[PDB]
Amino acid sequence: ENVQEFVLKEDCELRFAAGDDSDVCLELVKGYAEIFGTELLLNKKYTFPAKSRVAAFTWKGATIELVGTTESAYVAESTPMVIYLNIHAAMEEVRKKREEQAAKAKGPRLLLVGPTDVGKTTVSRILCNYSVRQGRTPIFVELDVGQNSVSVPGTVAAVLVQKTADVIDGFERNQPIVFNFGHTSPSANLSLYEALFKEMATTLNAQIQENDEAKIGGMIINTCGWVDGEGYKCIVKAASAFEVDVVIVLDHERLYSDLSKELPEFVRLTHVPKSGGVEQRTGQIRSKMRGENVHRYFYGTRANNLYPFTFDVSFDDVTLCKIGHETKLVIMEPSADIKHHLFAFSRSTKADENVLKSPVFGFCLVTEVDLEKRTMSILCPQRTIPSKVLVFSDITHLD
RNA sequence: GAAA
Ligand SMILES: Nc1ncnc2c1ncn2[C@@H]1O[C@H](COP(=O)(O)OP(=O)(O)O)[C@@H](O)[C@H]1O
Ligand SMILES: [Mg+2]
């Protein structure tokens, strides 16, 4: 197996992408390095799968070994990493000030905005990790229903971050708060999209009253890439609902310029460039990535294999329903057209007005519909259904 | 974000 050795000076990153076919293994063999804010352990072997795009950054200097076939691999001397560090530094300063002002203190809340493929999710992740590394537990809010790093696509979610992200597997998705939107873009139903993140914000505000460390941890809010048209007023409502202190605009000067005139004067607005290592992804790639996210939801990762159950449910034992006038519930009769669709297990016990603004327990996928036997087969993360009320998502998956 |  073929090996590549890289010497990184201080403030450089090794940018590489694993091949189309094979894995690439990475090992820090000298110095200190981090991958999107998580510290690498000396001499540990991190196996990344095909098509991964990764940057290992060092503040002090590093020597790194890559084993396996790469599509690209190079050391970059210029990065915006200090910018990202300074935003974290600034956040922690606000925390101290507010803690001292509370002899309960509320941490800073930061909204990241900008178009797709600017490294927004990556920055969110760096910022969450740096807070954890500072001793804090931030709440990561994920409003991107398309490319969601917390739950399945078609959801709006939040997780309390208590551990740095796993280098390979991202953050722990333990006990998130998940709302089912049911579409991959907000433009499919914008009034429902706003209702859901408004209920996210209110729910979060109540939950943090019972948790001092989460309250002072603050929020890092990742948004989707829809910054034009109605997408724009939606950024302003999200900044309002979550009472954000800071808006970070990534690589969009007109957007930065427009928010500067509309946001309240107390809201700090910063424009940062995208990293030279962010690469543009096609729709085929993002579609494939939505699929892998679904697969992960049920089957977990290589390091943490999850073992889901495939069992039959009677149509008499459940109620199928669908949201969408934009915010009305509709009872669905079992049909062949629900095959391959995700369904959310609602926390509402009855199919009524409560379903809309209720978070969900989790998701199943309908694999078979047996109309003659009046049963469906579902793939499910647990043994028995946690709720009898099943809410439709337009997201489909072939297992 | 998603669609073409
Ligand atoms: N500095 C970097 N070097 C190499 N790859 C990167 C870097 N920053 C981000 N990436 C990769 O680029 C892709 C897009 O990044 P992402 O944060 O998802 O962008 P956005 O969320 O704005 O669409 C991801 O695969 C990510 O791992
Ligand atoms: Mg993103």
Which SSEs are present, and which pair or pack?
Elements: E1 3-8, E2 12-18, E3 24-31, E4 34-35, E5 38-39, E6 45-48, E7 53-58, E8 62-67, E9 70-76, H1 81-100, E10 109-113, H2 120-133, E11 139-142, E12 155-160, E13 177-180, H3 190-207, H4 212-217, E14 219-222, H5 230-241, E15 246-250, H6 253-262, E16 268-272, H7 283-299, E17 309-314, E18 319-323, E19 329-332, E20 341-346, E21 360-370, E22 375-380, E23 389-396
Helix pairs in contact: 1-2, 3-5
Bound molecules: adenosine-5'-diphosphate and magnesium ion (MG).
It binds one RNA strand of 4 nucleotides through helix 7.
PDB class: rna binding protein/rna
Keywords: polynucleotide kinase, RNA BINDING PROTEIN-RNA complex
Assembly: dimeric
Structural descriptors:
24% helix; mRNA processing; 7-stranded mixed β-sheet; binds adenosine-5'-diphosphate; binds magnesium ion; 23 strands; 3 domains; Rossmann fold; Jelly Rolls; RNA-binding; alpha+beta; 7 helices; ATP-binding; 399 residues; Elongation Factor Tu (Ef-tu), domain 3
CATH class of the largest domain: Alpha Beta
Biggest sheet overview = 7 strands, mixed
CATH homologous superfamily annotation of the largest domain: P-loop containing nucleotide triphosphate hydrolases
CATH architecture of the largest domain: 3-Layer(aba) Sandwich
**Percent of residues in beta strands?**
25-35%
Helical proportion, percent range: 10-25%
Structurally, how many domains make up the residues? 3
Bound molecules: adenosine-5'-diphosphate, magnesium ion
Count of DSSP helices?
Answer: 7
Order of strands across the main sheet: 13-12-11-14-10-15-16
CATH fold-level assignment of the largest domain? Rossmann fold
Structural class: alpha+beta
End-to-end separation in angstroms reads: 32 Å
What Rg do the Cα atoms give? 22 Å
Number of strands: 23
What is the string of SSEs from the N terminus onward? EEEEEEEEEHEHEEEHHEHEHEHEEEEEEE
Overall morphology: globular
PDB class: rna binding protein/rna
Keywords: polynucleotide kinase, RNA BINDING PROTEIN-RNA complex
Assembly: dimeric
Entry title: bound to ssRNA tetranucleotide GAAA, ADP, and Mg2+
